[PDB]
Amino acid sequence: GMTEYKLVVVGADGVGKSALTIQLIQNHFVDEYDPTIEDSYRKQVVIDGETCLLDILDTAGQEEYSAMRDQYMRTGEGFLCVFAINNTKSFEDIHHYREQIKRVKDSEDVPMVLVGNKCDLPSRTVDTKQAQDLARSYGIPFIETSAKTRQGVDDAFYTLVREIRKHKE
Numbered sequence: 001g002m003t004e005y006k007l008v009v010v011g012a013d014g015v016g017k018s019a020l021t022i023q024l025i026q027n028h029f030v031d032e033y034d035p036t037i038e039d040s041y042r043k044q045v046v047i048d049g050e051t052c053l054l055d056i057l058d059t060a061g062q063e064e065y066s067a068m069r070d071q072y073m074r075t076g077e078g079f080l081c082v083f084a085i086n087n088t089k090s091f092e093d094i095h096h097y098r099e100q101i102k103r104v105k106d107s108e109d110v111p112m113v114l115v116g117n118k119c120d121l122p123s124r125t126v127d128t129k130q131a132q133d134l135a136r137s138y139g140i141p142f143i144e145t146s147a148k149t150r151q152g153v154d155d156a157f158y159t160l161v162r163e164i165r166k167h168k169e
């Protein structure tokens with residue numbers, strides 16, 4: 001039938017978590033999407049021959065650590081950790097998100113992909129090599145994306161899926 005994958009997109013405000021998701025779900029680029037709306041979106045795709053139902057939690061809201069919040073996040077099987085290549089602070093925040101993923105999942109090996117989004121923009125303050133260094137230290141893949149042009153958007157989610165497959169062994 002379908003193999004279900006629960007994906008969770010995390011990272012600072014304004015990096016493109018919603019644009020990335022809606023590009024995958026609805027195939028268009030949203031200029032302004034309510035920055036406060038957190039929701040899960042379901043999508044059927046074929047990845048490497050396998051029919052997949054992706055359940056994608058696009059995170060938002062206040063920073064808080066309620067039990068309900070922890071419980072929503074730890075249903076994630078894999079995580080897209082997203083920063084913008086023109087937002088140094090959002091890159092620096094990646095480690096915090098990874099730490100919270102490890103905590104709620106209670107594991108050192110959680111399927112994860114590092115995503116530098118907005119690669120269409122000229123005002124790059126985060127070097128590709130800087131983000132690669134981080135990704136290699138974590139043992140995770142790294143990919144640059146543009147939710148605006150769709151460059152790399154499919155690959156980023158599919159790569160996460162393949163990371164979940166490897167985790168299952």
Ligand SMILES: Cc1cccc2cccc(N3CCc4c(nc(OC[C@@H]5CCCN5C)nc4N4C[C@H]5CC[C@@H](C4)N5)C3)c12
Pocket residue numbers: 010011012013059060061062063064065069070073074093096097100101104
């Ligand atoms: C995200 C997450 C992943 C995995 C498990 C989690 C478990 C509990 C809570 C999580 N959340 C909930 C959401 C959230 C978390 N951390 C920060 O941290 C911001 C800054 C960064 C440095 C610390 N803090 C000062 N901001 C958040 N939100 C505030 C702004 C920004 C994004 C968006 C949401 N709107 C951590 C988890």
Ligand SMILES: Nc1nc2c(ncn2[C@@H]2O[C@H](COP(=O)(O)OP(=O)(O)O)[C@@H](O)[C@H]2O)c(=O)[nH]1
Pocket residue numbers: 011012013014015016017018019020030031032033034035117118119120121145146147148149
């Ligand atoms: N140029 C460019 N702008 C983007 C890209 N992704 C998102 N944006 C814009 O960045 C702003 C924040 O995007 P959003 O998806 O709401 O970020 P979120 O807060 O992480 O959900 C919006 O105005 C988007 O139009 C991208 O890949 N390239």
Ligand SMILES: [Mg+2]
Pocket residue numbers: 017018019033034035036037058059060
């Ligand atoms: Mg959003």
